[PDB]
From Swiss-Prot:
Fe(2+) binds at H182, E263. It is found in: Cytoplasm. Mg(2+) binds at E19, R45, D267, E271. Monomer. Interacts with frataxin/Fra. This is Coproporphyrin III ferrochelatase. The lineage of its organism: Bacteria, Bacillati, Bacillota, Bacilli, Bacillales. Fe-coproporphyrin III binds at Y12, R29, R45, Y46, S53, Y124. InterPro entries: Ferrochelatase (IPR001015), Ferrochelatase_AS (IPR019772), Ferrochelatase_C (IPR033644), Ferrochelatase_N (IPR033659). Its EC number is 4.99.1.9. Disruption phenotype: Deletion mutant requires hemin for growth.
Amino acid sequence: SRKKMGLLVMAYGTPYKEEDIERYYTHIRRGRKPEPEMLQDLKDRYEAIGGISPLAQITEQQAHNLEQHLNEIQDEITFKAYIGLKHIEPFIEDAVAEMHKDGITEAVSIVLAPHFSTFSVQSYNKRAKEEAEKLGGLTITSVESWYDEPKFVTYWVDRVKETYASMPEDERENAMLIVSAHSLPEKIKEFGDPYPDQLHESAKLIAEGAGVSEYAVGWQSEGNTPDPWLGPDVQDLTRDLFEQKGYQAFVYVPVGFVADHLEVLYDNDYECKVVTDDIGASYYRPEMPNAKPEFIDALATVVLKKLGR
Ligand SMILES: [Cl-]
Ligand SMILES: [Cl-]
Ligand SMILES: [Co+2]
Ligand SMILES: [Mg+2]
Ligand SMILES: [Mg+2]
Ligand SMILES: [Mg+2]
């Protein structure tokens, strides 16, 4: 009775083992192999955050729990998850070819990043669709953004409320909430890319829901292309706000990220923590969504809304 549909779950990708780091960052750096000192530094960072292998496992669990949950909560469609990644196998093109090979004719896609950008989401969506077109007989409907899904907002609102409630009274009245996403080159503005506006809306929605009146928006994890990247960076922002108003606690919500990956476990929990430690402020960073049931239900809702179900 049920209609079969592919569920294409797309993400940046993460290395699967230490020996993957070289090829992974080469791919990110557009063919430019990192120098030996950069490779060793990267290996050290991954060791510092508890190792590499749990990273890719999170994406796999998110895709599979999403598949199973979608299949449980409605009775019209049977979904089959396929993971397509940007910077490591299985690549996006590989996943589409496999759906096509398995006889899938209709699919829905979603990127594991809630905010639309021309650089990331649009590019993944275009690549998926071009491959489907090249093969023929397979169509894909693509989710473009989902930062504004109530259930996803609620996830972060609830985590923020819990954090502020755990604070001693003096920190609670002198805390600052920093809401962030991965920086992109500023030149996306040339196309009217709504990515920065969507991060600001994410921050508004989360702060409002949590009852937090003092918050700011920052960016993190900028690459090293020559042209300017979106700022301010979370490290500079933290220090600027501290020098400005003397906050005693900083709460970091990297809403652009969905998992315990390097850019959270290192770029927040180490790099921002260095700054808060230096200024004598408390550091808080609530749990990332990962594959938790509340997050999986939000993602399932997004997918079913996109399909008009
Ligand atoms: Cl959409
Ligand atoms: Cl959008
Ligand atoms: Co990055
Ligand atoms: Mg080894
Ligand atoms: Mg929308
Ligand atoms: Mg960095």
